[PDB]
Design an enzyme around this catalytic site. Structure first.
Site, mmCIF file in Angstrom:
data_model
loop_
_atom_site.group_PDB
_atom_site.id
_atom_site.type_symbol
_atom_site.label_atom_id
_atom_site.label_comp_id
_atom_site.label_asym_id
_atom_site.label_seq_id
_atom_site.Cartn_x
_atom_site.Cartn_y
_atom_site.Cartn_z
ATOM 1 N N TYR A 194 152.086 -32.236 -96.937
ATOM 2 C CA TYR A 194 151.543 -30.953 -96.658
ATOM 3 C C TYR A 194 151.345 -30.689 -95.080
ATOM 4 C CZ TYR A 194 151.475 -30.173 -101.553
ATOM 5 O OH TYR A 194 151.960 -30.223 -103.092
ATOM 6 N N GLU A 203 146.297 -34.948 -109.034
ATOM 7 C CA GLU A 203 145.851 -33.737 -108.270
ATOM 8 C C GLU A 203 144.652 -33.416 -108.615
ATOM 9 O OE1 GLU A 203 148.088 -29.337 -108.210
ATOM 10 O OE2 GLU A 203 149.220 -31.352 -108.351
ATOM 11 N N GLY A 228 140.953 -23.874 -87.819
ATOM 12 C CA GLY A 228 140.414 -22.945 -88.764
ATOM 13 C C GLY A 228 139.404 -23.767 -89.977
ATOM 14 N N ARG A 262 138.745 -23.502 -97.558
ATOM 15 C CA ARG A 262 138.541 -22.454 -98.071
ATOM 16 C C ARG A 262 139.259 -21.948 -99.464
ATOM 17 N NH1 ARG A 262 140.727 -21.661 -95.682
ATOM 18 N NH2 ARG A 262 141.257 -22.732 -93.754
ATOM 19 N N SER A 310 149.859 -35.745 -100.149
ATOM 20 C CA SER A 310 149.030 -34.955 -99.167
ATOM 21 C C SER A 310 149.704 -34.759 -98.118
ATOM 22 C CB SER A 310 147.636 -35.551 -98.969
ATOM 23 O OG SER A 310 146.522 -35.233 -99.779
ATOM 24 N N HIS A 363 143.586 -34.929 -98.294
ATOM 25 C CA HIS A 363 143.989 -33.232 -98.223
ATOM 26 C C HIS A 363 144.912 -33.283 -96.708
ATOM 27 C CE1 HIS A 363 143.610 -29.116 -99.028
ATOM 28 N NE2 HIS A 363 143.852 -28.910 -97.719
ATOM 29 N N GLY A 364 145.855 -32.946 -96.984
ATOM 30 C CA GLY A 364 146.932 -32.697 -95.852
ATOM 31 C C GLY A 364 146.841 -31.198 -95.443
ATOM 32 N N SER A 365 147.647 -30.945 -94.108
ATOM 33 C CA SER A 365 147.733 -29.670 -93.943
ATOM 34 C C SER A 365 148.481 -29.493 -92.594
ATOM 35 C CB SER A 365 146.333 -28.837 -93.677
ATOM 36 O OG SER A 365 146.313 -27.433 -93.897
HETATM 37 C C1 LIG Z 1 150.597 -26.467 -102.979
HETATM 38 C C2 LIG Z 1 148.918 -26.703 -102.715
HETATM 39 C C3 LIG Z 1 148.310 -28.296 -102.668
HETATM 40 N N1 LIG Z 1 148.414 -28.801 -104.182
HETATM 41 C C4 LIG Z 1 147.958 -29.987 -103.503
HETATM 42 C C5 LIG Z 1 147.726 -31.237 -104.372
HETATM 43 C C6 LIG Z 1 147.374 -32.356 -103.787
HETATM 44 C C7 LIG Z 1 147.244 -32.285 -102.415
HETATM 45 C C8 LIG Z 1 147.054 -31.093 -101.652
HETATM 46 C C9 LIG Z 1 146.825 -31.132 -100.147
HETATM 47 N N2 LIG Z 1 146.851 -30.012 -99.399
HETATM 48 O O1 LIG Z 1 146.577 -32.314 -99.495
HETATM 49 C C10 LIG Z 1 147.815 -29.762 -102.400
HETATM 50 N N3 LIG Z 1 148.236 -28.572 -101.915
HETATM 51 C C11 LIG Z 1 147.992 -25.633 -103.514
HETATM 52 C C12 LIG Z 1 146.885 -25.296 -102.796
HETATM 53 C C13 LIG Z 1 147.437 -25.462 -101.492
HETATM 54 N N4 LIG Z 1 148.576 -26.049 -101.580
#
Ligand SMILES: C[C@]1(c2nc3cccc(C(N)=O)c3[nH]2)CCCN1
Ligand SMILES: C[C@]1(c2nc3cccc(C(N)=O)c3[nH]2)CCCN1
Ligand SMILES: C[C@]1(c2nc3cccc(C(N)=O)c3[nH]2)CCCN1
Ligand SMILES: C[C@]1(c2nc3cccc(C(N)=O)c3[nH]2)CCCN1
Ligand SMILES: C[C@]1(c2nc3cccc(C(N)=O)c3[nH]2)CCCN1
Lengths: 350, 350, 350, 350, 350
Positions: free
Chosen positions: D246, D327, D210, D217, D243, D201-203
């Site tokens: 993102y 996914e 947060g 969340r 991931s 899970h990337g961000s």
């Molecule tokens: C585009 C979206 C998203 N789709 C993903 C599919 C695989 C991994 C990630 C992740 N964050 O690592 C994803 N994030 C939809 C929910 C928020 N962002």
């Protein structure tokens, strides 16, 4: 001073270069001390061919050695290679006979070139340029870089050259139109034969004096058959990439020569795997080895009746072939009309 | 007969091969008739170096020709190249001086090898194998193919060799452990210096007798500076691909030699573009040219303190560099400890 | 109910699938209305082979048509293909005879499978699973996914599968160890022959009942020679990619079967181009077609004496070959010992 | 001074970086003069979400403009973007609402981070490092680079990262084991649910305070649905490449953060195209979007029951999907157990 | 004898080929013994559609099995598939319903083709060629290979076909201009609608009789919605690569058919992920699924007002889409004007 254009004068120096002959021989490990250029003989080369054929026979039978040893020693007694130690390599397999024959082929054209470079009258009433030019018995003209002929040819080269084996890029430095003496009447008959195509034929630079003066020739009977996928004939390709590999150029000498000839193919006998024939089926007048890749047929083009397959390279219908490229073979030298000669610069990507 | 293992005996014949020397010279267009192997001199080569440096100076100043012509004629009077016609090439640019210097470098090691191949006592009380071996002043041992050393090395070669320039594939035929006389004490001091790495150093086969007998050397003062991105030093790479290109092998001679040396780098002065220094900043003991590609740091490995960067090749942090690969330079031969020598088979994909 | 493991039970249903037989026949345009499965005959297939051979002969001679027309009509009278219009395709070239022979090969194994699927006692004292299993005359066992055998095999498959033809990816679903009745003594002699290798052999799923029950067979004398690069023998590859193409799977049926056999090669006669021999040189016991690509020799591995060439694919020494992959041929079925059978899932990249 | 290890201290400075918050806002064209960091409000962000949802509705209905204009002006009145001229962009399509929502998502976590960075007691009895660390309510430990955990993870990253989108290479700089307060009991129940996997899970870096303090969340009800292929849930990938995109890193800031979480998937509802559900079929507890590429199943691995799909990327069975990667989505935050956090260095190939 | 040109006559035999119908059915595992071609019914197919829709509903609800079993048994009772053993596959997921629906779609056009191939008067007053041709109710003309139309089309095909999925190469064998009866007035209205484009539409060869005789149709209400990314409509692509995959050709039958139609798009509703609408926003008259790749806009071209996007394929602005290619959908058959039909030869690279 010579009235010949500068590009032709440079072409002349290229093919009649003694240093180049000497270099090809040392590349073969030949000992120039024992076998100087002027000492090369045709009968000596025929004898060597015979030995090679005998090795191939010994190899096919599976000779109980000893015979292989004596034949090997006989070959090196005729073709003096300097090794130093480790001893002379044994000629005990197809791969070995092929390499040696390829060498004899080249050594013969060098012998031919040296024999022409030393005849008639080595006087100076005329500069060496025009004299040697005359010895080719071939009329040579430069094709303007901005003409229709040049455009077609360059596209032929640019499109049939891909990226699958892009270890280099091709640059046309000079384009010559050619018509050797003799190859202006002999063809007239086979011209009354359909399926004439303009195809590529590459070859070592050191073989061009022989090629221009004598024309493309078919291997002699004493020559081994191993090495000719479809028997002793004259081979052409419709993809510059295929032919360019027979120019044997390198980063050291990135310049090579390549021919474009009109060949009256007639009905082509299609094959997908090596087959020694020379015998040809009734009604067939050539052989087309089917390759995995082929110029885009939609892009074909003609002129006067001679098809020019300059389409970019695409996958052909059949891949169940060993061949990567198309290959065309004819067994009569009269079916060939040498038309152009290109000086090419090979830029390696490395 | 020699008690030396067969692989070492073959190594010996390789580096002391006269035909190979002769071949490298003809590849340079040198006329052996005028300049035979036994006629090569060190002072002659130093003189040639001086001329080259003068050309570079003339080039940088922009000499009003004439001076360039005389210097060019002087170079070819010392180094007899046979051209035939077209006349000798003019040395009027950096690219030209670099090629000639690279040649003089190689010709010097050949001269060194020929001078060793003819000394002491050319008697037969002992076979030529053990005698010539002794002349190297280097202790040579074969590393078993199934040992820990061999495994590490092979992986080093397999991983730092990619597909970006895969014009060939690498196969290790023999692995030798080496320690030349002299390079066993001289290093002991610099061993008390951190950042020691096991790096690659490729070189023409015809230079190995000189390299083993004299060790890696730094270019002499008369030598042109052009051609050395970071001044006159000893260069190494951490990617076999970088070093392998200096072996100058080919389809004709697909076999080459390559070294692996332990170099006491110390604090490395990092640069991204060519810079002629040799002067070095206080506290720095080497130079690291930063390349676009680098072995995966996570995969680093050591032993006894010597790091071995056998990680597969990945993109490095900075690409704002001209360099493609990393490059390490040291300006003191004592910082180098030659450890292994590999006989490699280059398989070209073509 | 059957005591056989579930994976074997599934293997049994796969090879004795009537719908699969019917489907292969319709894929050949064969009209099941005229030629139902139960109507296939061995003598009928031999007759068809003979006709094909006659066409090849007519083709080589260059028959003045008419003869080609009658032979073509004779073939389709024996093998009822439904075309509708346009008329039956003319068999007038090597490419045509090869396709038809390949079909007859497959139709024969289907005939063999249908003939076994209907014999002995079609009663229900025992479920159809164990009965049909017995008819194979082959002992079948599942190899645990987490064992040494499975690991070696999977790596064999993973490494000899590259990206050059990655139109798909390979996934091993099941691994079976096999030893058919008869192939446990017959081999014992040739085991006293060196150079035994574990090689790949792919084949249409609809041919496995015949292969397991009768073993790999060499083409009959009435069969055309065209299509066999090195004469009528048993072919193997050392790169799963080469063999997998003979499984003829697709997006519709992405599942295929592939064998791994121990073959006592002995002295291999090396060739680079197609050559019809079957005659073999004294001292040679197999043929190795030299390919452009080959498993990394350094990665070779053994066990009990059988070499397993699971090295990743690298460029081989010679490229002057038509062949892309290595190819091994033996002319005595006793030189072959079928050891494993893999159920593979082909994932196409498209 | 802080007793925290140096790598954790650096992690703390990274996520609580005010300059980074300010930079993300200016990257959004937000005018800090009007909307400073300390002025961000949660109700303000909820209001903005509502407007976005109204635009999506207007877009789906095909509002006769005017309504689109007022909604657009309302959005920019709440979220003060500085454009200068050309006027504010019109929000009249799905693509537009998605971008704005993605921004509101990020702005909310920044607001959350700024609100934590300013609470309790801004005294100095303790250094800002330990205080801010405590505010995360998450226990953070460094995983030794040479351990079993680190090896598995690195391989996970190295193998699920290919060359199809190799615009960069991945380097793990730090690996942290994590267990936030609250996420140690809440999960215990769903642990009694099969099919638990360790997924990526990337961000954005600016969202980690947060994420660590509040956990992953699910989007609020006022939030637009456009942008979530499978409804408002928590998304994970089994290929680091998916991931990592993102993290929104670049040549300017090549450093990013990425999570690895244990998710109790249970029975997965498999789909190949976007589908807004959140409703879930009886017996299903998650959704798996089927991608064209997938980690090699044979290479799967476990531990304690949590599967780790670190197989190299291969073509999956079905390509009839829009998705490139797998996914996974869950609609209950309790199904998620954040385990590790990786600091990664992105090296772009450019 | 027919006055029709030879290429059209061949087109006619292709689409009305009974063997081809039979083959598509056996490829589906359908048992022709129970369900012969002449036994296919429209009501039977509608019934099957209904069952499929019920399975999808059962799947979405998460039916407690049993219901899934009975529905599955009901489907196979209507569509007699021969499996032999292992039992009939369970229809318990989206992927399963999609495959079956795709099959019913194809079986319906085959039923349509068989029903046309048997009507009016099966006499011989006229040859079967002209009769069947008339049954298409479509005027067919050959487009000369050397015309303006042919050049544009070929370039359209050559440029929108890349190397990313080059598992084959495309060769245009025949180009037909078409105007079916009915599709010459019905369109006239929508012609007074902007944004008309010439787009690709591929389809199984066995569906062309139905397509030419009835025109492109939108899925019936009983049909499952799963499988249509954007609801029940008529889909087109602007990249020949996208459409060509729906021709379902292979090495066995490398020949396929593909249409080019003029579609009056009007205002396009742009989306990046699957969305079931059919409802359309006010002012929109089509849907454009945004792909990652798109024809180079600079290379666009027109004629009479119909845009032809034959630009080579480049990366589009947004990649945040699941789609790889653009996709256009219309929900009114009157918005479509079939203009050309191409017979294409697929050469697989394998
Ligand atoms: C585009 C979206 C998203 N789709 C993903 C599919 C695989 C991994 C990630 C992740 N964050 O690592 C994803 N994030 C939809 C929910 C928020 N962002
Ligand atoms: C290997 C061999 C050869 N095969 C060829 C196929 C296409 C072109 C050429 C060419 N020279 O341009 C070829 N030369 C056999 C006859 C002599 N050399
Ligand atoms: C071009 C030059 C050179 N640069 C190198 C960089 C990495 C490795 C090597 C090597 N020999 O292995 C290099 N050789 C400059 C000094 C002499 N030759
Ligand atoms: C084309 C031919 C064939 N050549 C092969 C080369 C390597 C492997 C195989 C295999 N079946 O796995 C081969 N099959 C000739 C003999 C029957 N089929
Ligand atoms: C999958 C589906 C389909 N999607 C397409 C997108 C672009 C082109 C085509 C085509 N037939 O040329 C498509 N066909 C949904 C409707 C029926 N088949």
């Amino acid at each position: 001073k010579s009235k010949l254009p500068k590009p032709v004068q440079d072409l002349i120096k290229m093919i009649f270069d003694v240093e180049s002959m000497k270099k090809a021989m040392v590349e073969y490990e030949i000992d120039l001390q024992k076998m100087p250029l002027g000492k090369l003989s045709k009968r000596q080369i025929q004898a060597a061919y015979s030995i090679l054929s005998e090795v191939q026979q010994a190899v096919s039978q599976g000779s109980s050695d000893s015979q292989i040893l004596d034949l090997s020693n006989r070959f090196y007694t005729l073709i003096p290679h300097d090794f130093g130690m480790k001893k002379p390599p044994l000629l005990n397999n197809a791969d070995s006979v092929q390499a040696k024959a390829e060498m004899l082929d080249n050594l013969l054209d060098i012998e031919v070139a040296y024999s022409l470079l030393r005849g008639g009258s080595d006087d100076s009433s005329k500069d060496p340029i025009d004299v040697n030019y005359e010895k080719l018995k071939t009329d040579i003209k430069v094709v303007d870089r901005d003409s229709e002929e040049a455009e077609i040819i360059r596209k032929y080269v640019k499109n049939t050259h891909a990226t699958t084996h892009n270890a280099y890029d091709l640059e046309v430095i000079d384009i010559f139109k050619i018509e050797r003496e003799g190859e202006c009447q002999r063809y007239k008959p086979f011209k009354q034969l359909h399926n004439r195509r303009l195809l590529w034929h590459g070859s070592r630079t050191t073989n061009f004096a022989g090629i221009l003066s004598q024309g493309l020739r078919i291997a002699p009977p004493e020559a081994p058959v191993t090495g000719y996928m479809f028997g002793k004939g004259i081979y052409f390709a419709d993809m510059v990439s295929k032919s360019a590999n027979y120019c044997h150029t390198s980063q050291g000498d990135p310049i090579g020569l390549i021919l474009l000839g009109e060949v009256a193919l007639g009905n082509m006998y299609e094959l997908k795997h090596a087959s020694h024939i020379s015998k040809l089926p009734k009604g067939k007048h050539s052989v087309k080895g089917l390759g995995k890749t082929t110029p885009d047929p939609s892009a074909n083009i003609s002129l006067d009746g001679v098809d020019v397959p300059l389409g970019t390279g695409i996958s052909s219908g059949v891949n169940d072939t060993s061949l990567l490229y198309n290959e065309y073979i004819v067994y009569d030298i009269a079916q060939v009309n040498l038309k152009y000669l290109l000086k090419l610069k090979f830029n390696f990507k490395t």
